[PDB]
Amino acid sequence: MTEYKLVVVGAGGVGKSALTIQLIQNHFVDEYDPTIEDSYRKQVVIDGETCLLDILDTAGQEEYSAMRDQYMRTGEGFLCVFAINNTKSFEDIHQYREQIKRVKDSDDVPMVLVGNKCDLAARTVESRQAQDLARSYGIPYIETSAKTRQGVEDAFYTLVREIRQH
Amino acid sequence: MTEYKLVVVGAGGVGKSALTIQLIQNHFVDEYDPTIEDSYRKQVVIDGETCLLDILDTAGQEEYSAMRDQYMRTGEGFLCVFAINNTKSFEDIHQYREQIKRVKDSDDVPMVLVGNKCDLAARTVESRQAQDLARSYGIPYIETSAKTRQGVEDAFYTLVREIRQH
Ligand SMILES: CNc1ccccc1C(=O)O[C@H]1C[C@H](n2cnc3c(=O)[nH]c(N)nc32)O[C@@H]1COP(=O)(O)OP(=O)(O)NP(=O)(O)O
Ligand SMILES: CNc1ccccc1C(=O)O[C@H]1C[C@H](n2cnc3c(=O)[nH]c(N)nc32)O[C@@H]1COP(=O)(O)OP(=O)(O)NP(=O)(O)O
Ligand SMILES: [Mg+2]
Numbered sequence: 373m374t375e376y377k378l379v380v381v382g383a384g385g386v387g388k389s390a391l392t393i394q395l396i397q398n399h400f401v402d403e404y405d406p407t408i409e410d411s412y413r414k415q416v417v418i419d420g421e422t423c424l425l426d427i428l429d430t431a432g433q434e435e436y437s438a439m440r441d442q443y444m445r446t447g448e449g450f451l452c453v454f455a456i457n458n459t460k461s462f463e464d465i466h467q468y469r470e471q472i473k474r475v476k477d478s479d480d481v482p483m484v485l486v487g488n489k490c491d492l493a494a495r496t497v498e499s500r501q502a503q504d505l506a507r508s509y510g511i512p513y514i515e516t517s518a519k520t521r522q523g524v525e526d527a528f529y530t531l532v533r534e535i536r537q538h
Numbered sequence: 539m540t541e542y543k544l545v546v547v548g549a550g551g552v553g554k555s556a557l558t559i560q561l562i563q564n565h566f567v568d569e570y571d572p573t574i575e576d577s578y579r580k581q582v583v584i585d586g587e588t589c590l591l592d593i594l595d596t597a598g599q600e601e602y603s604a605m606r607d608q609y610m611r612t613g614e615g616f617l618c619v620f621a622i623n624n625t626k627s628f629e630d631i632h633q634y635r636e637q638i639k640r641v642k643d644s645d646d647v648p649m650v651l652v653g654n655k656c657d658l659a660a661r662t663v664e665s666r667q668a669q670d671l672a673r674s675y676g677i678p679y680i681e682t683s684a685k686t687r688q689g690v691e692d693a694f695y696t697l698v699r700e701i702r703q704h
């Protein structure tokens with residue numbers, strides 16, 4: 373079975389985990405619960421293809437210092453998430469893209485830029501500003517909302533689509 | 539307003555029109571109605587971006603001989619659809635990809651390969667076979683069902699995503 377090793381990175385607090393749980397077990401966790409490392413595995417059919425999604429939920433805090441280096445070594449594709457109401461988590465993105473190209477040895481790694489939490493009105497990261505980050509990376513920009521599930525499957529499946537042509 | 543000129547090509551009968559109507563006016567047309575040329579325009583918000591989708595529904599029959607050349611001249615991105623229960627409509631795809639590169643002057647035009655009608659069990663085009671067409675084009679493969687709307691927005695939005703990095 374084609375297995376897809378997806379890796380959800382991003383600053384602490386952006387909804388990394390709320391998005392994986394949304395995708396996987398069909399409900400929003402409106403709750404403070406910091407991750408260390410949760411992995412998830414699920415039979416899915418993506419575009420007729422039957423495959424296992426083996427997603428590794430990660431912590432955003434660099435208490436997970438170079439413990440990061442390990443999984444970015446093994447991750448095939450990555451969800452880079454930031455919250456659209458948090459310019460700082462946007463500005464952290466360049467940091468992850470850098471570490472990932474680092475351990476991963478390549479300038480172009482399958483990746484998706486994901487502007488999560490779009491359901492809310494206090495947005496400080498404008499869309500085109502994010503669409504301009506994504507384009508300079510040559511990656512897709514997908515806005516999501518783990519609350520309303522808008523974009524949730526879009527962001528995860530497009531990345532599987534990415535890993536394919538790579 | 540960013541306008542996206544999408545063009546839905548493909549053999550006669552594959553569901554080209556059922557997919558545009560699904561996207562646009564939220565219901566399946568289980569009905570014989572051959573197209574000549576229907577255009578559609580709709581305000582959408584794709585990834586925070588507010589934009590007009592100006593889709594041109596097309597006929598599959600080459601009674602629309604070189605009347606094709608005109609719109610493929612002007613279309614920015616294209617939905618290439620075939621029915622997964624119709625090996626012939628799959629084999630027609632290379633024909634459209636060829637005409638499109640023709641009038642369009644470029645080897646790589648934003649495009650989406652779309653294996654529509656996936657809800658049904660009489661499938662003669664296997665997914666990976668189609669996933670191998672798509673990859674040799676270096677384009678996304680998206681299976682849809684205008685009946686159940688599975689993939690319907692996926693296929694149209696990913697193409698808008700395509701036109702972006704182009
Ligand atoms: C009662 N609620 C709180 C009180 C105090 C502190 C925190 C919260 C809290 O639970 O907020 C949560 C949900 C919210 N969340 C996730 N995704 C979305 C989204 O799409 N929209 C909205 N509106 N909220 C979201 O985003 C916050 C963090 O979610 P998470 O999924 O745990 O975030 P993470 O990316 O996994 N952070 P980490 O790196 O620590 O694991
Ligand atoms: C009572 N029904 C018929 C009787 C006789 C002849 C034709 C039909 C008939 O209506 O079949 C339709 C719907 C079906 N359709 C479209 N999409 C789907 C899909 O996703 N799944 C299924 N199950 N059917 C679909 O696909 C057929 C063609 O749909 P269309 O959307 O009109 O196809 P087109 O691609 O626009 N053909 P064209 O080039 O002529 O405009
Ligand atoms: Mg968490």
Ligand SMILES: [Mg+2]
Pocket residue numbers: 554555556571572573
């Ligand atoms: Mg029609």
